[PDB]
Each structure stands twice: as structure tokens, then as C-alpha cells.
Tab-separated table of N, CA and C in Angstrom:
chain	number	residue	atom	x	y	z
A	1	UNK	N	323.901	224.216	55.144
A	1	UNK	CA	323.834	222.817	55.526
A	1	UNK	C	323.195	221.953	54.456
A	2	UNK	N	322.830	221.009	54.792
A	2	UNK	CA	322.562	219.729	53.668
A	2	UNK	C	321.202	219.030	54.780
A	3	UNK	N	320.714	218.291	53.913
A	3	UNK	CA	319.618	217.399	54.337
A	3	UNK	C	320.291	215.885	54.430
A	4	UNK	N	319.428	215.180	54.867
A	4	UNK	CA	319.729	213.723	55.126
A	4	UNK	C	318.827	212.768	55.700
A	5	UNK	N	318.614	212.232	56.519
A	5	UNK	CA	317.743	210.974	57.077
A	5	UNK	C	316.641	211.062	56.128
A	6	UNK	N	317.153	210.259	54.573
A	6	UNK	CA	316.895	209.768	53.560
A	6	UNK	C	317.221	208.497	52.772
A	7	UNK	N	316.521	207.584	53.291
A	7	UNK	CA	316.471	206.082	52.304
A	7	UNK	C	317.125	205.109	53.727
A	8	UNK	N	316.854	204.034	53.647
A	8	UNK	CA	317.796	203.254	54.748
A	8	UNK	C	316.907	201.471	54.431
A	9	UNK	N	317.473	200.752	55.201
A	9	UNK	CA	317.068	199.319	54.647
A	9	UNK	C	315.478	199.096	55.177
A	10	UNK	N	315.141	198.611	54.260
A	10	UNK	CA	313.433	198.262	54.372
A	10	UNK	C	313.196	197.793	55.025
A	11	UNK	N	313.785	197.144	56.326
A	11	UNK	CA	313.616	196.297	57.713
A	11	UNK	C	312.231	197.182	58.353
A	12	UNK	N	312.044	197.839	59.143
A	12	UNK	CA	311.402	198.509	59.480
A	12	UNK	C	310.258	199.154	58.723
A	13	UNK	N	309.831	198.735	57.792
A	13	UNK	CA	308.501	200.519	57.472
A	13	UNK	C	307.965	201.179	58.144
A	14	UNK	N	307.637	200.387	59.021
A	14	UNK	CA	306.288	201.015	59.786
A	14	UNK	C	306.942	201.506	60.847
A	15	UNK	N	306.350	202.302	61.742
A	15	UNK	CA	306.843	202.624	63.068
A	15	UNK	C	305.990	202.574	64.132
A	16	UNK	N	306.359	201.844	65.221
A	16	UNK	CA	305.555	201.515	66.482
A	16	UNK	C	305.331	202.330	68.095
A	17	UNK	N	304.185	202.899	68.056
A	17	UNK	CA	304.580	203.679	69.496
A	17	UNK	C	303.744	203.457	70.784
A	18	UNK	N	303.940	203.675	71.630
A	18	UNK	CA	303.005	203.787	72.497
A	18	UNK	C	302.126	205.052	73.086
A	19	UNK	N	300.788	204.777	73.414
A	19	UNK	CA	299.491	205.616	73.855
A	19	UNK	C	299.118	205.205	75.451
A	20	UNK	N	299.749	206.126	76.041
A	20	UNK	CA	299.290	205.737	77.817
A	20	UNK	C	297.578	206.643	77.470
A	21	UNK	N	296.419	206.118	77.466
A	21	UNK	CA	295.283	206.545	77.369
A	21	UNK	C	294.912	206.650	78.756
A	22	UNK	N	293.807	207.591	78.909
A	22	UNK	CA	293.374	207.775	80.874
A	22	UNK	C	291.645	207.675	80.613
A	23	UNK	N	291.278	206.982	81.623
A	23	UNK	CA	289.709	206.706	81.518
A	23	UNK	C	289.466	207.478	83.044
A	24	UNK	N	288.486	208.855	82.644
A	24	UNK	CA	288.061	209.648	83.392
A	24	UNK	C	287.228	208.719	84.680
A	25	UNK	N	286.509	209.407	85.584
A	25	UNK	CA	286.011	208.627	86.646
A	25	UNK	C	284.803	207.890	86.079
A	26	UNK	N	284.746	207.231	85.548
A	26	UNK	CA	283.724	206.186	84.991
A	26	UNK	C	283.719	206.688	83.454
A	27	UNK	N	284.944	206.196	83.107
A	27	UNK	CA	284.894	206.543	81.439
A	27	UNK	C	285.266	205.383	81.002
A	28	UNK	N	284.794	205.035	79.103
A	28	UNK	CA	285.663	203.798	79.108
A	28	UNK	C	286.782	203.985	77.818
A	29	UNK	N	286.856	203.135	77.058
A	29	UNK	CA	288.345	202.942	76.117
A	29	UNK	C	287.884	203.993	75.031
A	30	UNK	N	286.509	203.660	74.335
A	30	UNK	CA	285.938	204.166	73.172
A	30	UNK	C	286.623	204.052	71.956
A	31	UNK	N	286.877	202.806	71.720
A	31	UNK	CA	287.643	202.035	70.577
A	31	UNK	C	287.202	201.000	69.519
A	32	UNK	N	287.070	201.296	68.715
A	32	UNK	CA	286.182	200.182	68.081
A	32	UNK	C	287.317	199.442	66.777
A	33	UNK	N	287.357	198.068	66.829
A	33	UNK	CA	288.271	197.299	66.774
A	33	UNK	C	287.880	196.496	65.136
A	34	UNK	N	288.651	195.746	64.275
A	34	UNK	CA	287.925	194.330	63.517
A	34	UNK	C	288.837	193.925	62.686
A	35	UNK	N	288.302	192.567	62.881
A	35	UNK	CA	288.774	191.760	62.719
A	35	UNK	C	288.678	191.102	60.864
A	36	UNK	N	290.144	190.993	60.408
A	36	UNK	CA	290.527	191.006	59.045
A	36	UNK	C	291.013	189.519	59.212
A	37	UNK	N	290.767	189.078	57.984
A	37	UNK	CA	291.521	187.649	57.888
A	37	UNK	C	292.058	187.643	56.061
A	38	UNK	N	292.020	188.506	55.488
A	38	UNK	CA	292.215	188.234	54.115
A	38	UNK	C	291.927	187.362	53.261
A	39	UNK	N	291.137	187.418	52.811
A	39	UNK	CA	290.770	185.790	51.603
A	39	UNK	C	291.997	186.095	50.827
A	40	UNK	N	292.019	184.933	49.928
A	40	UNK	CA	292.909	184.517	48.691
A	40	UNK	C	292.629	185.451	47.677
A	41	UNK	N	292.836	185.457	46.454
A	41	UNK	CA	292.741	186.255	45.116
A	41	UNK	C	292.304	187.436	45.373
A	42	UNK	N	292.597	188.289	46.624
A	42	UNK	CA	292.321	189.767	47.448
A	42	UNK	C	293.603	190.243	47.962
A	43	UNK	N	293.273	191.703	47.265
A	43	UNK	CA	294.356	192.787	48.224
A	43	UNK	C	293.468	193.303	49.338
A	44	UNK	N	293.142	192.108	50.162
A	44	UNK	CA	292.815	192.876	51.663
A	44	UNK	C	294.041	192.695	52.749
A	45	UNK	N	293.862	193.167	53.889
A	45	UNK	CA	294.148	192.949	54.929
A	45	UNK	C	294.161	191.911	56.028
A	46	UNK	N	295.433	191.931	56.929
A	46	UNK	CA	294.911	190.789	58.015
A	46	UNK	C	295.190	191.399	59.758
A	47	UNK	N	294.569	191.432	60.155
A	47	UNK	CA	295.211	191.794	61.474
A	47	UNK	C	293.853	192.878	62.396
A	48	UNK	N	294.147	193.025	63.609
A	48	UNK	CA	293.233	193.804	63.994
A	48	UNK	C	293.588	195.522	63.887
A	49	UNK	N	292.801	196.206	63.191
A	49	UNK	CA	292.612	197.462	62.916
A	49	UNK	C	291.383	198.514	63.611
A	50	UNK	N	291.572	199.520	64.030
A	50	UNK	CA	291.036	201.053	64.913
A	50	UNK	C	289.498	201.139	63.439
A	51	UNK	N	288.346	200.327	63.680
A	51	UNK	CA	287.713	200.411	62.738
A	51	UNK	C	287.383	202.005	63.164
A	52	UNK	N	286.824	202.367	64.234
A	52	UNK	CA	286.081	203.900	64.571
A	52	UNK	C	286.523	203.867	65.584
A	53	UNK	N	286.385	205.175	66.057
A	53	UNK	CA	286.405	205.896	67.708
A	53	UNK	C	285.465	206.757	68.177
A	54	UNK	N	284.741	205.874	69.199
A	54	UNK	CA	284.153	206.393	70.135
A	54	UNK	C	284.037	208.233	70.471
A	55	UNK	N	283.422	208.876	69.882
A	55	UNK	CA	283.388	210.380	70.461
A	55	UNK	C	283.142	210.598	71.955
A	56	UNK	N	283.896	211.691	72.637
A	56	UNK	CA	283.766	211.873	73.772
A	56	UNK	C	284.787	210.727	74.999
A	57	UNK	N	285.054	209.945	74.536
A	57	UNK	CA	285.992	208.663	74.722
A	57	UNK	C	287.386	209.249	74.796
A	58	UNK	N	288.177	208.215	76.100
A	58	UNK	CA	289.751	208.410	76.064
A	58	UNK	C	290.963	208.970	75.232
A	59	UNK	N	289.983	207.363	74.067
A	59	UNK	CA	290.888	207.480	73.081
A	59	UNK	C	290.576	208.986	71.664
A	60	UNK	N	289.054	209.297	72.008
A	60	UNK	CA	289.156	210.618	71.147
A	60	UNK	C	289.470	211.342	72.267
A	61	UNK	N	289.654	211.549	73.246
A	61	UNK	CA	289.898	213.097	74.008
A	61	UNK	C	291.661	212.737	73.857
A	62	UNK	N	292.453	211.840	74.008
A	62	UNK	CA	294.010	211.994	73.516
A	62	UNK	C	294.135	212.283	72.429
A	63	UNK	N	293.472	212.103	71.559
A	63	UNK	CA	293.857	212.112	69.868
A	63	UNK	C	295.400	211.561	69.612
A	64	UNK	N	295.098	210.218	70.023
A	64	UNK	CA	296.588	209.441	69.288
A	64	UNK	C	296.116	208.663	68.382
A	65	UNK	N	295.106	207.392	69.255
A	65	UNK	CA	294.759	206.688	68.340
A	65	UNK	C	293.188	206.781	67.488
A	66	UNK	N	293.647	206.600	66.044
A	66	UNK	CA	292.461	206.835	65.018
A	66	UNK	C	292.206	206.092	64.023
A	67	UNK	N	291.225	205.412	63.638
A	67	UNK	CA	291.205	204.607	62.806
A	67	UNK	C	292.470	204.742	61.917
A	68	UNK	N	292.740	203.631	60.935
A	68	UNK	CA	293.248	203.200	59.709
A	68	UNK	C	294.538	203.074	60.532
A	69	UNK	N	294.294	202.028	61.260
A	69	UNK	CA	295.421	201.317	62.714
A	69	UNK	C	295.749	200.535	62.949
A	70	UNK	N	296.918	199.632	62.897
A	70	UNK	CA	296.987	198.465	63.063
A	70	UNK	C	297.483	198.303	64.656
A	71	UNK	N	296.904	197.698	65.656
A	71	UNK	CA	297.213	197.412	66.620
A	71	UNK	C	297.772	196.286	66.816
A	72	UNK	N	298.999	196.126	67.660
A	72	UNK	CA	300.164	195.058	68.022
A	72	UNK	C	300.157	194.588	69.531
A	73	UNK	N	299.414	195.419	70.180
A	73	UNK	CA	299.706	195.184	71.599
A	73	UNK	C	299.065	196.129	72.078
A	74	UNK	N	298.091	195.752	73.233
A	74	UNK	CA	297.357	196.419	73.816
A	74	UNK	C	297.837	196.754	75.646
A	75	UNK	N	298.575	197.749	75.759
A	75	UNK	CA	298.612	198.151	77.334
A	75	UNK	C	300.136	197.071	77.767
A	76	UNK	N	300.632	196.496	76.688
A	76	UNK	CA	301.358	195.461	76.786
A	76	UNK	C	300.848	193.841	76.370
A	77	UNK	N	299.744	194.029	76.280
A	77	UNK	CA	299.303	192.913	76.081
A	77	UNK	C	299.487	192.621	74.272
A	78	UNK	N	300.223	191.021	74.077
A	78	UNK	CA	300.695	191.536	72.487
A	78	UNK	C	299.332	190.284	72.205
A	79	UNK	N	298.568	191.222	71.376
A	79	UNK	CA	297.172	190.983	70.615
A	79	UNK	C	297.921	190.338	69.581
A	80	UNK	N	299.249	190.768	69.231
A	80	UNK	CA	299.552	190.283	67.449
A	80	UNK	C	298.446	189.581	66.921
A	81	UNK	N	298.776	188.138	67.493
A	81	UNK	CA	297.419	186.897	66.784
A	81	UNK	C	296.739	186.358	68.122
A	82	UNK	N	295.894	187.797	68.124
A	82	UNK	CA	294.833	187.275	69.061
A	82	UNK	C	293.482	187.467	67.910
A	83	UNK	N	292.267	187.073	68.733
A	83	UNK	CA	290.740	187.414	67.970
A	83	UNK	C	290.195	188.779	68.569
A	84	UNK	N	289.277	188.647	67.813
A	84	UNK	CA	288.587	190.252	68.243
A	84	UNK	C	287.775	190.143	69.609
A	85	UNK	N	287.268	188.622	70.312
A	85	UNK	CA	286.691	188.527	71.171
A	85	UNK	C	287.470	188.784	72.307
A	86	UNK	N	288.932	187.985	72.330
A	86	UNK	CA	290.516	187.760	72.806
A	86	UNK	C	290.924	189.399	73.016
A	87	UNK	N	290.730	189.925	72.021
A	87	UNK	CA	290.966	191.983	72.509
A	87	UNK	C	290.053	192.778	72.707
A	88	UNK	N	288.677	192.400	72.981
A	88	UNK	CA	288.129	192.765	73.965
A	88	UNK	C	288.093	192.803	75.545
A	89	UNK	N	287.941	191.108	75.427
A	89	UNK	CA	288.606	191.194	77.470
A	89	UNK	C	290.008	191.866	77.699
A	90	UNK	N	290.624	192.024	76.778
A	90	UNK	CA	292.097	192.646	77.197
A	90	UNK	C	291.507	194.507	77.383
A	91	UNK	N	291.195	194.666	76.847
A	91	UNK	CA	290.300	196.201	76.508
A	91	UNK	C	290.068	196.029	78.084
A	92	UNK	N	289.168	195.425	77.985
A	92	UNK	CA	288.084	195.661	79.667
A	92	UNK	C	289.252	195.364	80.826
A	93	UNK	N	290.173	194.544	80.736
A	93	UNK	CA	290.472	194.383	82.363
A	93	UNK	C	291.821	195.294	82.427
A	94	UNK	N	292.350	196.145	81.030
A	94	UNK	CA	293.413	196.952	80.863
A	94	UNK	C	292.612	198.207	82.080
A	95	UNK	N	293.216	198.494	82.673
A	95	UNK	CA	293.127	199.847	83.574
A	95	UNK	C	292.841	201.025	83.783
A	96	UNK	N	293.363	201.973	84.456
A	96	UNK	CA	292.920	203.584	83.483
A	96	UNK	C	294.690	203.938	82.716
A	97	UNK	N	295.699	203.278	83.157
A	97	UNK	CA	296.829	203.515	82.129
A	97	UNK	C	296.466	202.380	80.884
A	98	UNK	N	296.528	202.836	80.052
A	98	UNK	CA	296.585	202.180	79.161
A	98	UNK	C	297.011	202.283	77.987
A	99	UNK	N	298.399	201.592	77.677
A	99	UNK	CA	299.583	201.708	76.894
A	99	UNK	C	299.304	201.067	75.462
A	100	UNK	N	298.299	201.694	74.288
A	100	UNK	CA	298.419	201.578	72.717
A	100	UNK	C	299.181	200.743	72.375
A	101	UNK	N	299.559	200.153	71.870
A	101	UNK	CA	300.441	199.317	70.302
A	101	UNK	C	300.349	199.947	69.101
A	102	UNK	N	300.456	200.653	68.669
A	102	UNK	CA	299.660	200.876	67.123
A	102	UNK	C	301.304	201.058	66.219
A	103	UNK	N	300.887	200.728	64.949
A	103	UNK	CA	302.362	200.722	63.853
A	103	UNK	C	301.497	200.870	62.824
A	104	UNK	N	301.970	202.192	62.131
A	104	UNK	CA	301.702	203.058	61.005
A	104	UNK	C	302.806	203.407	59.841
A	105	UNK	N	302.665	203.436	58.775
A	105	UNK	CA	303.629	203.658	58.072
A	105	UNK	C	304.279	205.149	57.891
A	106	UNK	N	306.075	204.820	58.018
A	106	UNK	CA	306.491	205.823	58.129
A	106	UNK	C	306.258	206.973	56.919
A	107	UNK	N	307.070	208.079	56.778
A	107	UNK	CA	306.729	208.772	56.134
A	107	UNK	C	305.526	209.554	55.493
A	108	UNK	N	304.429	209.486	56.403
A	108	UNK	CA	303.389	209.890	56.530
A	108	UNK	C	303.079	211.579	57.394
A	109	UNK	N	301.895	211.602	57.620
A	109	UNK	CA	301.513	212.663	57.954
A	109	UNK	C	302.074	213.109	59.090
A	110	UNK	N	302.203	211.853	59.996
A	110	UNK	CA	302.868	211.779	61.201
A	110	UNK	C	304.047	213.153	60.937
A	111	UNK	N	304.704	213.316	62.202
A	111	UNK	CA	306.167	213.802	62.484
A	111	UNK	C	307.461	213.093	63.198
A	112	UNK	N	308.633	212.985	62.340
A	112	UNK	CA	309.321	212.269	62.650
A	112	UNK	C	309.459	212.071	63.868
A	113	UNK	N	310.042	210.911	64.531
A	113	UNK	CA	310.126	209.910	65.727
A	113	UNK	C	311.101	210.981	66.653
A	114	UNK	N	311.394	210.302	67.692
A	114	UNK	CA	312.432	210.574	68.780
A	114	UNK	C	313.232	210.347	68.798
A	115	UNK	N	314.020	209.224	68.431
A	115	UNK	CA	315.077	208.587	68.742
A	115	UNK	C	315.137	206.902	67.235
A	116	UNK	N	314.679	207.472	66.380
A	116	UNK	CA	314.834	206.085	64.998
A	116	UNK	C	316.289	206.158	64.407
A	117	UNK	N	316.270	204.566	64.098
A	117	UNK	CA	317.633	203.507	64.016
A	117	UNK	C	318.322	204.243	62.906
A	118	UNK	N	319.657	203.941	62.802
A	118	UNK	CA	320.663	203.834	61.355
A	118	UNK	C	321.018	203.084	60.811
A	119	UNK	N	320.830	202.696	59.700
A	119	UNK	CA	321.538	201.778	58.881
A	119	UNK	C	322.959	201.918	58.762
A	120	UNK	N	323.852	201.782	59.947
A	120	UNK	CA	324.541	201.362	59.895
A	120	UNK	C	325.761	200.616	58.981
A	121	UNK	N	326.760	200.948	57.903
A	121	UNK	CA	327.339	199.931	57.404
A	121	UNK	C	328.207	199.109	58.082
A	122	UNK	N	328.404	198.408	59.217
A	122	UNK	CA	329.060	197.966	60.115
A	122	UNK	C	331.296	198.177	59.887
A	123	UNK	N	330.889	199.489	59.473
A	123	UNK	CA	332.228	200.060	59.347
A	123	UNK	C	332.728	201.006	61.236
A	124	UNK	N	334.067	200.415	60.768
A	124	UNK	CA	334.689	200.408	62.097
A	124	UNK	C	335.514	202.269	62.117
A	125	UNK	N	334.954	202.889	61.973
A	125	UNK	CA	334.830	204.508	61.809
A	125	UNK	C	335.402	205.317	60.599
A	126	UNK	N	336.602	205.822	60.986
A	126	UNK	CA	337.161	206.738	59.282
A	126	UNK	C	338.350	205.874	59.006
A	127	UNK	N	338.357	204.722	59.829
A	127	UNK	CA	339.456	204.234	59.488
A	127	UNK	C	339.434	203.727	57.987
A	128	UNK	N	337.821	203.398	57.249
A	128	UNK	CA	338.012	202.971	55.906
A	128	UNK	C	336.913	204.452	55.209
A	129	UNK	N	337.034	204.236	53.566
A	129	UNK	CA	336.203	205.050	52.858
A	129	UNK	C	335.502	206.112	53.627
């Protein structure tokens, strides 16, 4: 055989999943969050990122989410451009399901996805090349 699901259009890098997390009978998120804004004449960052995790916590007893994280949506709730104060109350009144956002770049340590897209050439089957 041959290899393949190699190279495709740069639309996508990153890949986005979800974390149903469970908070034991009086447990809480154990997530620690911060807030980036990027100055000018800097290769920093902007967005809210998994600064640490809580030991003994949800989110370390799942081992999904771990620092160096960009979070998009919390439980459904889309943080995109929220503040760090703004994803805290979302933290607290989120439940014991509680459905992650996080988008990491592909080709990483990770293992490939479930079900990721094709680039497609919008060719209408063997009828051409």
C-alpha cells in the first residue's frame, strides 16, 4: 500500500475538540486561565490560554485539557472575545458536564482526529483527470 493524508489547504491548522469534564461530589473545574492581549513590535499572543492545572482537579483527573491551550468555547459557551473575568463566571455556573473548546495545532503529538475534512478539488468524479 501507499501512504497519504498529506498536505491539504491551510484553511484549518488547528483542530478543535470537545472535553465533557465531570466535577466529583463537591469538586471543582481546576483550570487556570490568562489573559493575552499582544502588544505591538511582539511575537506574543492573544486570546485566552490553559495557563496551569489544578492537581487532583476534573480537568487533571481527565487528562484532556493542559496548558499551552487555546480555549474557544467553554461548555458551549463561545469565550472567543470574552475577558478573563467574563470566563470565569462561565467556569462557575458551567455544571458537572462540561464541554472544553480547546484548538491545538495539528500535526502534533496529538493522534489523528475521527472524522477530518478533504480538500476536495470540486471535481465531478473520474469523469475528468
Amino acid at each position: 500500500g501507499s501512504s497519504g493524508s498529506s498536505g491539504g489547504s491551510d484553511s484549518s491548522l488547528f483542530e478543535t475538540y470537545n472535553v465533557e469534564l465531570v466535577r466529583k461530589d463537591g469538586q471543582s473545574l481546576g483550570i487556570r486561565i490568562v489573559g493575552y492581549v499582544g502588544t505591538s513590535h511582539t511575537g506574543e499572543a492573544s486570546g485566552i490560554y490553559v495557563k496551569s492545572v489544578i492537581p487532583g482537579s476534573a480537568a487533571y483527573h481527565n487528562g484532556h485539557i493542559q496548558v499551552n491551550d487555546k480555549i474557544v468555547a467553554v461548555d458551549g459557551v463561545n469565550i472567543q472575545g470574552f475577558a478573563n473575568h467574563d470566563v470565569v463566571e462561565v467556569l462557575r455556573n458551567a455544571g458537572q458536564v462540561v464541554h472544553l473548546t480547546l484548538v491545538r495545532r495539528k500535526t502534533s503529538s496529538s493522534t489523528s482526529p475521527l472524522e477530518p475534512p478533504s480538500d476536495r478539488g470540486t471535481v465531478s468524479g473520474p469523469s475528468s483527470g
